[PDB]
Paper text:
One construct spanning aa 82–390 (named atATC) was purified as a stable homotrimer, and matched in size (excluding the 2.6 kDa fusion tag) the 36 kDa mature enzyme in whole leaf extracts. atATC produced diffraction quality crystals readily and the structure was determined at 1.7 Å resolution. The relative orientation of the domains is similar to the open conformation observed in other ATCs crystallized without ligands. Unexpectedly, additional electron density in each active site indicated the presence of a molecule of UMP captured during protein expression and kept throughout the purification and crystallization process. The nucleotide fills the active site, with the ribose in C3′ endo pucker and the base in anti conformation. The 4-O atom of the pyrimidine ring interacts with R310 (Asp-loop), and the 2-O and 3-NH bind through three waters to R310, R248, and V250 (C-domain), whereas the C5 and C6 atoms make Van der Waals contacts with the 349PLP351 loop (C-domain). With UMP, the CP-loop folds in an extended “inhibited” conformation, with A164, A165 and S162 interacting with the nucleotide, S163 and K166 pointing outwards the active site, and the side chain of F161 inserted in between subunits. Rather than occupying an allosteric pocket, UMP binds and blocks the active site, directly competing with CP, the substrate binding in first place. UMP binds to the subunit in a wide-open conformation, where the N- and C-domains cannot move further apart to accommodate a di- or tri-phosphorylated nucleotide, thus explaining why UDP or UTP are not inhibitors.
However, much remains unknown in plants about the unique organization, regulation, and localization of the enzymes required for de novo biosynthesis of pyrimidines, which are potential targets for crop improvement and weed control. In general, ATCs consist of a catalytic homotrimer with three active sites in between the subunits that can be allosterically regulated by association with other proteins.
Numbering used by the authors:
A (entry chain A), B (entry chain A), C (entry chain A): 79 to 390
The structure:
Amino acid sequence: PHMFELSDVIEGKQFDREMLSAIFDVAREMEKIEKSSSQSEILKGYLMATLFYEPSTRTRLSFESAMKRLGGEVLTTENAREFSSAAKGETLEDTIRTVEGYSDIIVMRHFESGAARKAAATANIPVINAGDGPGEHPTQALLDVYTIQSEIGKLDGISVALVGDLANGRTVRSLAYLLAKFKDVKIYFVSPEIVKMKDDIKDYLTSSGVEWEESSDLMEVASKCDVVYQTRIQRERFGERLDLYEAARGKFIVDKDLLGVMQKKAIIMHPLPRLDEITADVDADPRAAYFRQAKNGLFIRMALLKLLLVGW
Amino acid sequence: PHMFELSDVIEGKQFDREMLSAIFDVAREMEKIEKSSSQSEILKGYLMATLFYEPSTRTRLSFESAMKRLGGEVLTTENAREFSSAAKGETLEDTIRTVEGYSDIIVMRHFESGAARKAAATANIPVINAGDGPGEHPTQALLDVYTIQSEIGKLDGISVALVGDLANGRTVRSLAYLLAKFKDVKIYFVSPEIVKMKDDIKDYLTSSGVEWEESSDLMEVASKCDVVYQTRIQRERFGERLDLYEAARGKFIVDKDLLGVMQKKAIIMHPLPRLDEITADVDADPRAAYFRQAKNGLFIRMALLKLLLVGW
Amino acid sequence: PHMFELSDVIEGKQFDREMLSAIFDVAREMEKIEKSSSQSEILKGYLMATLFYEPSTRTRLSFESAMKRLGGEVLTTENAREFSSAAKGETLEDTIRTVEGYSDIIVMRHFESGAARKAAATANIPVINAGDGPGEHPTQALLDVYTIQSEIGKLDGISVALVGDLANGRTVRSLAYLLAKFKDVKIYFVSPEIVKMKDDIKDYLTSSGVEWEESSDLMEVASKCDVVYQTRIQRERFGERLDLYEAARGKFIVDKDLLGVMQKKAIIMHPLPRLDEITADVDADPRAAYFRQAKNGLFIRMALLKLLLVGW
Ligand SMILES: O=c1ccn([C@@H]2O[C@H](COP(=O)(O)O)[C@@H](O)[C@H]2O)c(=O)[nH]1
Ligand SMILES: O=c1ccn([C@@H]2O[C@H](COP(=O)(O)O)[C@@H](O)[C@H]2O)c(=O)[nH]1
Ligand SMILES: O=c1ccn([C@@H]2O[C@H](COP(=O)(O)O)[C@@H](O)[C@H]2O)c(=O)[nH]1
């Protein structure tokens, strides 16, 4: 029993292999707490301030549920820019130093990348980054990795297909970053070439020992993977090249025909929300894990709230 | 002591005479709980997810108060369409299967009729329909009927005037539907002809044994009724016929002159919010029951939350 | 131990010197409660309804934190005008008489001055005015005065500089009003002439025994004051006179050069949010009290909630 080594949860680079493993063990303990028919009091007396600068229902409710499942309570806003209705203006550092007097922990979702680290540096209470604009989304990365460990039973020696908009894929990028901290990992980059993964991730994996391989053929890669992590490709990413959007039409979808070629022990993941890139009849298959994945986000966020406030 | 026979609260057709009577008895028990100076713990450890797709303050707070008066806690949103601020799109069934991992019961207010039943079919936790777009609003119907039983002392053998926009009146339609399950009921349809009640309700009552009668003369009908259930008529319902809107001007209002012709034991009901169809000086009369009616909504919604989560 | 002499908290004129002093003593007790590692239950079983007609994050969270630090619970809205999503319209008195059935105390922030007093007159539960449109903001006045007493150690015999837009300054006006209830007070009105304080305050102070003096020279006045209460001047207040806005540019700012001329025992206050009228490097100085000031708002609002619901 000791203090959590992290003062804040901001970026994926904060985590090493052993810290991840320990957090995942705590998440399993949080699942036991959530399953119990007794109300937990671990965080009784603690207040979480949800500081969202835009509405983002799923992830906010996941945090607020985690706090209340542990016996803590919540202050919420999805209008953080509106500091006062009578005097215009808002400054992140002033909001933090004001709200930290009302709460014991801040969960912030800003619109600008880099805001989370500034808030952590300013606040004298722990801060969790719930989505740093277009930047880091660390608890989504943790729950993604945790879901793989939970569903497949291991993180060493697995094969993961990262599908969709990889060039601009916030979560596929951070998922590959955390998976590179484990051994004998193989990652498939499944995409159209114009939204293929960028070199910084490609070069970080190689220099990490991770084997990787690019493809345009999801149906082939699928049969060899433990995990198929799906994300959308927005039509706007193709610009004027509707010939390429017509040539990709139906080639990166997860549907029953794709499930038919996958191992019985592989899973489909999707951070949500989804468009048509996973058909509705996939949901009935036990390998459709994207809703168990969301539930794992509750356990992970319970773990971080607990560790940051009362330690190991 | 046993399980509630309803898995969800969606539509008025789910309820028969005896179920209504039993629910109303539970609502009376909930009133005793709310009146107590001790905090209830009946729903300690349970979380209610308020899934509103549009802001609707009164009815949301009625639900959230009911949960907290019973010792449960709440997750709220009036922006349910905004599943994620970073990835556009929302799908009802995906929202339900995501949020049900954070909560024990869902109270949803969608914008499209039929959404509540789909959510119930998808969710593995109970669902309450708090307003199904232009469709069912069952807890408003229950609290309307409960208010009559509470104020008049009976439901068999009463006379109720349904006033206002009856053709498109969501709540007058469902109120008449539930009242038709009791005996020797008489219903007055008080309206301009162009917003008169529709045949489906007229034919369901007749085939239910309920006696009914249409009128354009509220001042006559009022003196014969136990209940005057008032609703607005929006000027837009008249279209271009401002001659009819001028001919109806002042004819379907509840004012002191109308109270002067009503029995001392009759009541005024209004689901709220009201416009000018009930004058402010009616409020001081003990027969103005529309605020006691709103309070009864708390008791009814306490009862449903309790029954759905812990049974009879 | 007895009943709070105030049924509601609406206007500064409700408070006399002795009531203020007693409230400030309770606020000090509330600070002890907030500091404790035990969850308070003083307001267990009580519900606060936050009825905000516009979003105003800081002050809402200050109230909602105060309630939860005392063990009470909260119903919130920043969309109070949206009584129902299906039927348009909202009437203050109908909202109050509806929501008071769901709660034990109402904290309202309306958009129109005079709304708070109407709500108090209508409600059978206590009401706190959290910002009456352009009108009274009493808890901000209380926390402003309380901050001075807490930081300087006294209210009799002090010198306070009120800086910024004084003509339209909601909080400088009410701060001077409450300070005039103490002895040997001296107030400096530091402003451009076109946003100078108005006669009603100037004449109320004189008739109160308070000495006052107007100035355009913050750097002089600062060295003689116990308190420098800063507020912005919006460029729009100058209208077309950009020559005056250019002549005032840099003359009413709080910066390190101004701190260099102030007593070591003086403080900087600012109700927040601020623009550029306090430079960021002032924050590191122990005399920058605007964030301790916000924290004092929590204690004051805890005190009022406690007194109004359970008395002295
Ligand atoms: O089709 C999709 C759906 C989601 N996401 C990522 O998953 C995150 C889900 O977390 P949140 O936005 O709900 O908090 C999004 O922010 C986004 O970065 C994608 O990349 N593609
Ligand atoms: O003048 C009125 C006021 C309310 N309603 C009905 O009463 C409901 C009140 O419930 P809620 O909208 O507040 O949840 C409305 O949705 C609407 O269907 C009317 O028909 N006419
Ligand atoms: O530069 C400023 C900042 C704030 N205020 C006053 O301080 C109040 C802060 O309280 P609130 O608006 O956050 O509730 C504002 O409403 C406003 O009246 C000013 O006069 N000038």
